[PDB]
Amino acid sequence: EPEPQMVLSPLTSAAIFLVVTIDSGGEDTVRDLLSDVASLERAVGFRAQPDGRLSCVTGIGSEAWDRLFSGARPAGLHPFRELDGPVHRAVATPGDLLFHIRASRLDLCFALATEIMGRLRGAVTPQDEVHGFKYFDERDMLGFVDGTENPTGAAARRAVLVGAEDPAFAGGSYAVVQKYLHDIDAWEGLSVEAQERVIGRRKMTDVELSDDVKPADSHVALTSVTGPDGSDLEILRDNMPFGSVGREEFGTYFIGYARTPEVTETMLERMFLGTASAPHDRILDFSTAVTGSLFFTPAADFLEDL
Amino acid sequence: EPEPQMVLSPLTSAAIFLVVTIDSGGEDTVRDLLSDVASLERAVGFRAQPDGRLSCVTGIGSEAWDRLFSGARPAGLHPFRELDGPVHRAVATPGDLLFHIRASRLDLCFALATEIMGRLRGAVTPQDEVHGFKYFDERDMLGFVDGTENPTGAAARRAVLVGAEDPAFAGGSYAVVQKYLHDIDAWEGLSVEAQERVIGRRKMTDVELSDDVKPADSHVALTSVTGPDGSDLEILRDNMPFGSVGREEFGTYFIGYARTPEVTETMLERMFLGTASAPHDRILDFSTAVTGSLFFTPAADFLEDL
Amino acid sequence: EPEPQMVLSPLTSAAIFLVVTIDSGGEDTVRDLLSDVASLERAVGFRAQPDGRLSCVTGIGSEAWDRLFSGARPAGLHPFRELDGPVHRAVATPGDLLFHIRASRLDLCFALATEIMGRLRGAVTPQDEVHGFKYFDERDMLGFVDGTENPTGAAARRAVLVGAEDPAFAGGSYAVVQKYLHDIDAWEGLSVEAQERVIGRRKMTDVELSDDVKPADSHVALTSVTGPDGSDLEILRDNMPFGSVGREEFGTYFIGYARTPEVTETMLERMFLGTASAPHDRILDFSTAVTGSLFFTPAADFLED
Amino acid sequence: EPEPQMVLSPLTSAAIFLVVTIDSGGEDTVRDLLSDVASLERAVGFRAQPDGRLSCVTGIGSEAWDRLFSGARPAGLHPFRELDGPVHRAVATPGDLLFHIRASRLDLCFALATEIMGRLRGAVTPQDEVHGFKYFDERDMLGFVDGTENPTGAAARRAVLVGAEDPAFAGGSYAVVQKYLHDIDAWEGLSVEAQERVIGRRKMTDVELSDDVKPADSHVALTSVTGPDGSDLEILRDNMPFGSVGREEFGTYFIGYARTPEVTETMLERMFLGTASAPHDRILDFSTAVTGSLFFTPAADFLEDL
Amino acid sequence: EPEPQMVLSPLTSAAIFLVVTIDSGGEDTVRDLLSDVASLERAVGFRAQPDGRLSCVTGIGSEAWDRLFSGARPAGLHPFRELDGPVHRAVATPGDLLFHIRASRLDLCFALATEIMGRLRGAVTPQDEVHGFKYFDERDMLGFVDGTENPTGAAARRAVLVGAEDPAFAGGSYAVVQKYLHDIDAWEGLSVEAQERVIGRRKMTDVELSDDVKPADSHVALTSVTGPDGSDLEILRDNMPFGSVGREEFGTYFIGYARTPEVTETMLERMFLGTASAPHDRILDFSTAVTGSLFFTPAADFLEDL
Amino acid sequence: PEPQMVLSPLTSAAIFLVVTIDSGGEDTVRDLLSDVASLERAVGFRAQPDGRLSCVTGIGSEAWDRLFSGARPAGLHPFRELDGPVHRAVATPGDLLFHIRASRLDLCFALATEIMGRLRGAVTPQDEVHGFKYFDERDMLGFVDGTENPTGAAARRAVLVGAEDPAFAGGSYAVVQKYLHDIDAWEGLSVEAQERVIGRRKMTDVELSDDVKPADSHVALTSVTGPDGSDLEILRDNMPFGSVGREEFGTYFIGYARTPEVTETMLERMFLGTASAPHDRILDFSTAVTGSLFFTPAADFLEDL
Ligand code: HEM
Ligand code: HEM
Ligand code: HEM
Ligand code: HEM
Ligand SMILES: [Mg+2]
Ligand SMILES: [Mg+2]
Ligand SMILES: [O]
Ligand SMILES: [O]
Ligand SMILES: [O]
Ligand SMILES: [O]
Ligand SMILES: [O]
Ligand SMILES: [O]
Secondary structure, three states: OOOOOOOOOOOOOEEEEEEEEEOOOOHHHHHHHHHHHHHHHHHHHHHHOOOOOOEEEEEEOHHHHHHHOOOOOOOOOOOOOOEEOOOOEEOOOOOOEEEEEEEOOHHHHHHHHHHHHHHHOOOEEEEEEEEEEOOOOOEOOOOOEOOOOOOOHHHHHHHHOOOOOOHHHOOOEEEEEEEEEEOHHHHHOOOHHHHHHHHOEOOOOOOEOOOOOOOOOOHHHHOOEEOOOOOEEOOEEOOEEEEEOOOOEEEEEEEEEEOOHHHHHHHHHHHHHOOOOOOOOHHHHOEEEOOOEEEEEOOHHHHHOO | OOOOOOOOOOOOOEEEEEEEEEOOOOHHHHHHHHHHHHHHHHHHHHHHOOOOOOEEEEEEOHHHHHHHOOOOOOOOOOOOOOEEOOOOEEOOOOOOEEEEEEEOOHHHHHHHHHHHHHHHOOOEEEEEEEEEEOOOOOEOOOOOEOOOOOOOHHHHHHHHOOOOOOHHHOOOEEEEEEEEEEOHHHHHOOOHHHHHHHHOEOOOOOOEOOOOOOOOOOHHHHOOEEOOOOOEEOOEEOOEEEEEOOOOEEEEEEEEEEOOHHHHHHHHHHHHHOOOOOOOOHHHHOEEEOOOEEEEEOOHHHHHOO | OOOOOOOOOOOOOEEEEEEEEEOOOOHHHHHHHHHHHHHHHHHHHHHHOOOOOOEEEEEEOHHHHHHHOOOOOOOOOOOOOOEEOOOOEEOOOOOOEEEEEEEOOHHHHHHHHHHHHHHHOOOEEEEEEEEEEOOOOOEOOOOOEOOOOOOOHHHHHHHHOOOOOOHHHOOOEEEEEEEEEEOHHHHHOOOHHHHHHHHOEOOOOOOEOOOOOOOOOOHHHHOOEEOOOOOEEOOEEOOEEEEEOOOOEEEEEEEEEEOOHHHHHHHHHHHHHOOOOOOOOHHHHOEEEOOOEEEEEOOHHHHHO | OOOOOOOOOOOOOEEEEEEEEEOOOOHHHHHHHHHHHHHHHHHHHHHHOOOOOOEEEEEEOHHHHHHHOOOOOOOOOOOOOOEEOOOOEEOOOOOOEEEEEEEOOHHHHHHHHHHHHHHHOOOEEEEEEEEEEOOOOOEOOOOOEOOOOOOOHHHHHHHHOOOOOOHHHOOOEEEEEEEEEEOHHHHHOOOHHHHHHHHOEOOOOOOEOOOOOOOOOOHHHHOOEEOOOOOEEOOEEOOEEEEEOOOOEEEEEEEEEEOOHHHHHHHHHHHHHOOOOOOOOHHHHOEEEOOOEEEEEOOHHHHHOO | OOOOOOOOOOOOOEEEEEEEEEOOOOHHHHHHHHHHHHHHHHHHHHHHOOOOOOEEEEEEOHHHHHHHOOOOOOOOOOOOOOEEOOOOEEOOOOOOEEEEEEEOOHHHHHHHHHHHHHHHEOOEEEEEEEEEEOEOOOEOOOOOEOOOOOOOHHHHHHHHOOOOOOHHHOOOEEEEEEEEEEOHHHHHOOOHHHHHHHHOEOOOOOOEOOOOOOOOOOHHHHOOEEOOOOOEEOOEEOOEEEEEOOOOEEEEEEEEEEOOHHHHHHHHHHHHHOOOOOOOOHHHHOEEEOOOEEEEEOOHHHHHOO | OOOOOOOOOOOOEEEEEEEEEOOOOHHHHHHHHHHHHHHHHHHHHHHOOOOOOEEEEEEOHHHHHHHOOOOOOOOOOOOOOEEOOOOEEOOOOOOEEEEEEEOOHHHHHHHHHHHHHHHOOOEEEEEEEEEEOEOOOEOOOOOEOOOOOOOHHHHHHHHOOOOOOHHHOOOEEEEEEEEEEOHHHHOOOOHHHHHHHHOEOOOOOOEOOOOOOOOOOHHHHOOEEOOOOOEEOOEEOOEEEEEOOOOEEEEEEEEEEOOHHHHHHHHHHHHOOOOOOOOOHHHHOEEEOOOEEEEEOOHHHHHOO
16 A cells, blocks of 8 residues: 555544635645644644544545646546536535545644634635534434444445555545534424434434335435445445534535545436436435535645655 | 532633623513523533533623512622723623533533523523633633632632521622733733733742732732731632634633622722722733623522512 | 432443342341342442442342331331232242342353352342343433433432331331333334334433324333322433343343332323323333342441441 | 454454354255454444454364264364263363354454344354453462463464365364363462462463472463474464353363364373373362363355355 | 541542641631531532542640630540560650541542641641552551451441440541551561461462461451450441652551541550460551641531531 | 564553573573573463563573574674763663563563473572653653654564574564663653653643754654665663652653664663754653663464474
8 A cells, every 4th residue: 555544534523514614825834734634633642542532534635736736636526516406416615635634633723723713814715614423323403313224344445545546546535514504393204213214213222124124215225326346335424413402404524435426426317317216315405515526635644845 | 508609610711791780671581591501510410420520600791680670689699890990991791691601621611501591592692702711721811820819718708608697688699791812913012021920929839929019000919909807808819711713802801709899899999990009000001901790699589489 | 317228239241130039047048148249249349349240139038028127117128019910010029138139240240149148148048040141322222221210319318218207217218119021022013103103212312202103002101100199200210121032032020119119009000000091101012021129228327236 | 375264363352152052954054154243343343443353263063073964074073072981070061153252342242243133033042151261460260370372373274274184164263162071169279389280380470380399280280282293282272261240150261273173182192181190170179070072263265155 | 416527438539637736826717617528528529429428527636625625524535655575666656637538549638638738828837648549459568458447337337436435526436546557578588388377368369377276476366356345346448558768668547437436546545565375466467657646627517516 | 483572562560670690500591591482371371461561581691692502593682882972872681671561560470480480590680670650651851751752563673683683583673771760850840841852742741842952952863764764663662760769760761673773772872863953852860870782582482492
C-alpha cells in the first residue's frame, strides 16, 4: 500500500463535518495547510491516546483539485451530479474541501477543527458545519440501527480504497456527503410495522425482513446493488445524527466512501429515480437532502508531500 | 428532608441548556409537563444506567411564577438585574423556564430535550439552546481548569439548597445563567503569565496564585466573598464550553446555583461594577455576556404534586 | 443500629436464584451457614472489587422460621397465598431458604453459590436454581425496559426496610419470588402498539403512556397502588430473564422486596383477580407463574448471631 | 483470500454451545439458515459494539455434510473416533451442526441462539446446550489458568486454517468438542503441589514446571506433540466452565480447533491410550467425557453462497 | 458538624507514603502548609475527576503536636511504643508528619507529593518514602488477598473516627504505620497448606479456615480481638506492596486506622509478645518491621482553620 | 522472522532493568534467554487483554562476544561517550537490558521478579527504574512526549533490521540514557522560553513554525534527513521516574532504531552541536547519568538457544 487516511476508523461517537470553499487567492494557504493536517491531527490527538481515537479525513472537490494541483486527476473525480427525480431531488451544493473529523468525544473534534480553521482564516469561506453524535445503541434519528451491513476488514479495504485501476491515486477513496433533514412528525405517525416496511429491517431487533415480505421500494432493497460479476457492490457509511430541538431540526448527515463514485451514484439513482418495480426509496418521503457534494480523499502520503 | 432536583450532579461531560418563554394560553401545557418531567428523566435515562448520569434541573422565572402558581413566592425570586457598569454590561434577557440537562453523552441530553419540547410544542417559544461539551482536562475555552473550587458534600448542600429561612421552598435553589462569548484572538495574544494574572490561578498546574501576587482585579479575587461571620460565601458552578468554528463563536455558558441569589448577585456586582481597589474583573475584557436570567429550581416534590 | 443485607444493590447483570428446603435434622447445619454467609460473600467477592459487585441476600420462609428460631417472628411473615383467579392462578410452591446472588458476572455468582451449597450438602434439598442474565439495555424477555420506576435513595429505604413498626426486625425486608414462563410465539404475534397496551409504556423509548390512552388492564395500571393517604405504595424489583433455547423456555424470574408483604400481595391480587374495570393483568395472557414463595430477609446483624 | 469465520476470536467471557441433529426432511430449512447466519450475527451484535464481541462459528458433521451438499468433501472430515482406553473412554455422541457462540455477556449469546433456533424449529433435534462462563482470572473449574499456551497471530492462523493442502476448503477449520464433568471432591482433596503435578504448571503463578520435574503423565506433557519435521503441533482451544450447583455438576466444555483433525486426534490418543512412559493423562482421573463430536467449520463465503 | 479527612477512601491502586521530621525552626512553614493541603489536593486532583480518586490524609506525631499547637492534645496521642518480644521486635522510628497519598494512578500521587514537599523543603527532613502498588487481585507480596475483613460503611465510621469520647477532636483518627520487609525465599519454601496455616485463610479462594483447624498462632487468630462487651474490635487497613527486584526488597507497607490507638496496640502486643497459647504471630517469621510510628489525623476543618 | 515486541501499544508503566553478567554466569543467562517469552506469557496471559505486558530483551556488545560465537550484528558496539564543550554523554556498564512494559506496574514487577529469580548469582544489577506515565503523556518538564514517533509501517521500517544485515533481520538497536532534570532551574523560565527550548507549544503540543523555532531547540536538533531527502526516524518510549524526598525528577530515555547510526547522529547533534547551534538547550536542564547500547534480537533467535 501507500498509506491511506483513516477512512476505516473504529467506531466513534462524535463527529464534526466541515465543508468550505476556497476564496480566490486562497490556494497557497490551503496547500500549506494540507501538508500539515496530519501533524495537527497528532498534536491534538496524541495526548488523548488511546481512548480519544481522533482522526481527520480530508477531501478535495473536483473544481478545487484543478485549482490546487499541477498534473493528473483521479479518474472518478467530477462534481456531484444533481438528480431530478419525478418526486424527490438530490441537490448539488458547493464544497471544495471536506474535513471529516471523528473521535470518542466532541471536544477533540472541536479542538482539531479550531486549529485547521485557524490556519485557513481569510482563505476559505465556511459552507456547512455539523456536530454529530451517535445514539447509544447505534441508532439514527428515525430510531433504526444504522451501520449494520457495513463491510468489515478486508472486504471494507477492497470496497473503499483505490488500487491498481488508478495507481497514481492508490490508497485514496471517494466520499459523497448529503445533509438530510427529517419530517419526524410524519414518521412518528406511522406504526412500527409501516416504518419497518420503509427501511426493510425490524426496528427493535435489527433483523432483515425476509425476501418474501421486504418491499421493493424499501431503503434496503433499493441500496442493494449487484455488479456485472454477480457479487454485491458495497460502500462504507458513517451516518451521524445531528440537530437542534428549538428549531425542530432532526437530521442525518450521510457520508459514504467507495473506491469509485459509480457505486454510490448508482445507489443514489435507484433511490431518487427509482427502478422498474419502485418509484423511489420510501425513506425520501421522510427525508429531504439539503446538501450534496463529492470529494476525493487522497492517500496520506500524497498530502504530506506538497 | 424534601427531595431536591439533581442540582448536585456528578461531573458530566455534556449538557443542553434550554431557555424558553411561555406563550399566552400555554400555562396549562407547561403545568402538565412540569408534573411529568421527573418521569421523563427516568424514561430516557434508566436504560443507559449507570454510565449515562442523565439529569434535568427545571427552573422557573419570576414573571412566569406569577402566571403559573398562586400562593407563596420563593423569597429571593425576582427578575435578573441588569448591571450597567462603567465599561462592561451584564444584560437581562427574557426567560420563563430553564431546562439544565446533563449527562455523560450528548445523545441522552438530546433525547430528553426532544421529549420535553415535544410536549411543549405550541405553548412556548425558544429563546436559547446551547449544546455544551467539556474539554478533556475539565478545561474551559480559555484553557484553564474550571470548577476546582466548587464546594462538595455537606458544604455544597449548605451553599445551594434553601432551608429553614424559607421553609415552604426548602430543597430548592436559585440558578443564574449567562451566555458568554470570548475574544480568543485577544486572549491568545497574552503570555501565559499574563493570563494567569487575569484568572488568579496557574494555568498548567491549577495552583492558586499566592495572596502577595494575585491581583485585586483577577477573577478569583473578585469572586471571593466573605459573609458577616468571616466564612466564605460559596456557589456551585457547572460552566460548559460551546461554540461553532465556522462562525468563530467560542463560548462559556455560565450557570451558578446558590441558596439565595444575593451571593451570586454580589459576585456579579464586583465583577461588572468594580470595587474601590478593582475597576472590574479582567476576565470581562475577553468575555461578553449576551444573555442573563434568574430562575428558581424547586424541590422535586413541589413539581410532582401540582 | 442495624445493618441491612444488600437488598438495595447497584445494577447487576447476572444473578443466581437458589431456593431450597431444609431436610429433617438439617437445622443446625443451616444455622451454622447462616452465621457465616456474609463472610463467604466477602471471601469470594473482595478480590474481584470494585467491578464484581457480588452480593448475596438470604431469606427465610415462614415454616422454616419456626424450625430454626424461637421467640419473636417478623410480623408479616406467612406462607405465600395461592391466588385462584377466574382465568389465571398464582401457585404457592415449597421453599425454606432463598439465596439471591447478584454480580456483574455469572462466574462470581456461581463461585459463591458453590461455597454455600458446599456447606449445606446433606442438610437441604434444592427446589429451584435459575441463572439469570439481563439484556444489554436493561430489557427483559418481552423486549421492554424493566426496572424504570423502581424507587431509589431514601424512597427505596422507606419502601423496602422494616422500621419502627416491628423494631426487633428493623433493617429486614420481605421478598416475594415467582418464576414466570412466557409464550414468546404468542407475544411476538402482537404489533408493537398492542404490546405497549399490555405493558403501559412505549417499547423503544420507555415513556409511560398518558392516562387518557393507558388501558386499565395494562401491567403498569394494575401495579400502581395508592395507600389510604393518597401516596404511592412502592416495591423494589430486580426481575431477571432466564432460559434454555433447546427446551423452548423463555422466562422472567420475578423478585420483589417490600417493607411489608401487604403491598406486594395487593399488587398480585389486582393482577390475578382483577378490579372493577379490569378482569386481570394482560401480561398474564403471555406469562405463567410456575413457582411462588415468600421470605423474610433479616438484617445482616441478625444472621451474624 | 477467502474470509474465515471468527475462529480466532478475542478473549470472551461467555459462550453458548449448541449441538443439534437434522431431522428427516430438515435439510432445506438448514441450508436457508446457514446462508443467513452471518447476517443474524451482525443483526444481534452490531448494536452492542464495540464491547459485545459477539460471534458465531458454525460447524457441520461428516454425515450431515453428505445430506446438505454435493460435490467435494473436506479431506479430513469423518465421524469422531471413539477411544476405548484401558481405564478411560472418549465417547462419540451424535451431532450434525455445531453453533459455538461467544460474547462478552451471556445475554448476547442467548439472543443469537434464540434467533438461530427460531429458524430451525421443526427441522432439528437438540442434543446439547451448554451455557459457559469464564472465571475472572481466566481460570477453569479446576482452578488453573486455561488458555496460556494457545498460539496467537500468524502462528494461530497457520495452526487452525485449512490452506493449500485442500484448496477448495481453504479458510475452514476442524473443531472437536467434548463435554467433561469433574469430580471436584476428589480434586480438592489433593494438595496444590499434587494438582500442579497433574497439570504440569504452577497453580498461582501459571509458570510451567521445568522439564526435569514435570511428570510424563501430566496434561501438558502428554498434549505437547512434535511433528515429523521437529516443529510443535498446535491447536486453538477455548475451554469453558459450566455447571449447576443444585445438581452437583461442575464441568469443562472442551473445544479445540485445528487445520487438520489428525493433530487433535493425536493429542486425544496420548491422553486416553497413553504412551510408552505414561498410562494416561492424569487429568482424566478427575474428568469424565460424556459427549464427543467432530465438525468442519467452513469459510464464511462458503456459507454465504448457498 | 465536623468533616473528616478521606480516611475511608474507596479502593485505590497506587499510594505514596511520606514520613518526615520537622527541623528546628520549621514549625511556621509546616503550619502554613497544613492549612493549604486540602487546596493542593483539589488543585492536583480536580482535573482528573472522577476517575483519579486522589486524596491525602495528613497525620501529626505526638512530639510534633506539642511543637505546632497549644491547647488540647487528642487523648490517645503518644509516641509509638517499641515492643521488645522474646524473638521479634517492633521498632519505633522518628516521624513528625505523615502524608498518606492515594489515587487510581501513581502520577497523581507523585504530583501532589511534589507540591507538598516543594512548600516544605528547608523545613522538614524526609525519613521514609514508599511508592506502593496493588498486586493482582488485591494480593500482597505473600500471595494472599489483603483487606478482606476490613469494616465497611457504618461499621467502618464507628471503628475509625473519634467521636463523643474526645469531642474537641471528633472526626479525627489515629494511624499506625510499619514498613515490613519479607523473606520471600523462606516463604516460598513452604507448601501452600503451610502458608495457609501461617495466615489463617485459604490462599486461592480467600476462605477463612474453620475454628476446628485454624492455628492459635496464625495471623488471623492473633489479630481477632473481642472487647469486654463481647463485640469485635476492628481497624481499617490499607496495606500496600512495594519493592525493588535488584535489591531483593519485597515489602508490605502496613497502615492501620482506628478511633483509639489501644485497639491497634493490642493487636500488635498479641503479634509480637504472644498469648498463653501462641508465642508470636507466625507471619513475623517471614516479615521484619523496619519502621514504626503513630500519628493523629485531625478532622479536615481543624487543618483549614490555622 | 518474528521480532520482539519493540512496537508496543502505549503502556502506562515500565520497569527498566540493566544488569552485568558475572564471571561464569553465561550459561545461566543463555538458559533464561530461551525461556523469557514463556515467562512473559505465564505472567501476562491471565490479565489479557488489558494487561499489555511485554518484555524486550537486549544484549550489549561485550556480552554478545561472551555468550555467542560466529557472526555479530553489523552495528553492535559499546555506547560512544560524547565529550562536548559543555555537556557530556557518559557510557556506563550494561550487558543485558530488560525493557518491561504494561498497563499496570504489578505485571511489570511480577515478570521482573521471575527473570531476576532465574538469574540470581549470575548477574549484578546496575540500574532499576520504575517508570510511570504522567498525566496526558507528559514528561517531567511538562511537555507531551511521544507525539512525533512513527507509527505503523513507517515505524516497522525505522526500527527493524532487514536485508542490510540479513542474518539478524527482525532485530533492533536500543539506546538508553537515564536523565535527571534540574526542575528549579527549568521552572524559573517562562512558558514561552520553555517552548523555545523544546520547539513545540506547551499546552497544545503544536510544533512552532519554522520561522520561530530556534536552531538549538530539541526538535530542531533531533530532526535529521538522510542523503535522499527522507526523514531518519527512531521510536522512543521515554518514561518519567523519580523520588520526591531526594528531589530526583527524571526522564528515562529509550530509543529504538534499525541501525545505531541514526540514534548516534541525533546524540552528536545534541551534545556536540552544529554549525548554527552550540548544543541542545534541553541539556541545560537535563544531565545524563547512564548510557548503554543494546541489540534486541528477533524473538526466534532467543527461542532457539
Ligand atoms: C436519510 C438518509 C439515510 C438514512 C437515515 C439511512 C438509514 C439506513 C438504515 C437504518 C440502514 C439499515 C441498517 C444498515 O445496514 O446500516 C441503511 C442501510 C443502507 N443505506 Fe442508508 N440511510 C440513508 C441514506 C442512504 C444513502 C443516501 C445511501 C446511498 C447513497 C444509503 C445506503 C445505504 C446502504 C448501501 C445500506 C445497506 C443496504 C444493505 O446492503 O443491507 N443510505 N441505511
Ligand atoms: C466567562 C465567564 C467565566 C469563566 C471562563 C470562568 C472561569 C473560571 C475559572 C477558570 C475559575 C478558577 C477555577 C475554579 O475554581 O473554577 C473560576 C472560579 C470562579 N468563578 Fe468563574 N468564570 C466565569 C464566570 C463567572 C461568573 C459570572 C461568576 C459569578 C457570578 C463566577 C464565579 C466564580 C467563582 C465563585 C469562582 C471560585 C473562586 C474561588 O473561591 O476561588 N465565574 N471561574
Ligand atoms: C478435561 C478438561 C480440560 C481441562 C480442564 C484442560 C485444562 C488445561 C490447562 C489448565 C492447561 C494449561 C494452560 C494452557 O491452557 O496452556 C491446558 C493445556 C492444554 N490442553 Fe488442556 N484441558 C482439558 C482437555 C484437553 C483436551 C481434551 C486436549 C486435546 C484434545 C487439551 C489440549 C491442551 C493443550 C494442547 C494444551 C497446551 C499444552 C502446551 O503447553 O503446549 N486439553 N489444558
Ligand atoms: C533528556 C530527556 C529528553 C526529553 C525530556 C525529551 C523530550 C522530548 C519532547 C517533549 C519532544 C517533543 C514531542 C515528541 O515528538 O515526542 C521530543 C521529541 C524528540 N526527541 Fe526527545 N527528549 C529527550 C531526549 C532525547 C534524546 C536523547 C533523543 C535522541 C537521541 C531524542 C530524540 C527526539 C526525537 C527524534 C524527537 C522527535 C523530533 C521530531 O521530528 O519532531 N530525545 N523529545
Ligand atoms: Mg534539609
Ligand atoms: Mg533543585
Ligand atoms: O445509510
Ligand atoms: O466560574
Ligand atoms: O415487574
Ligand atoms: O486445554
Ligand atoms: O493486615
Ligand atoms: O525524546
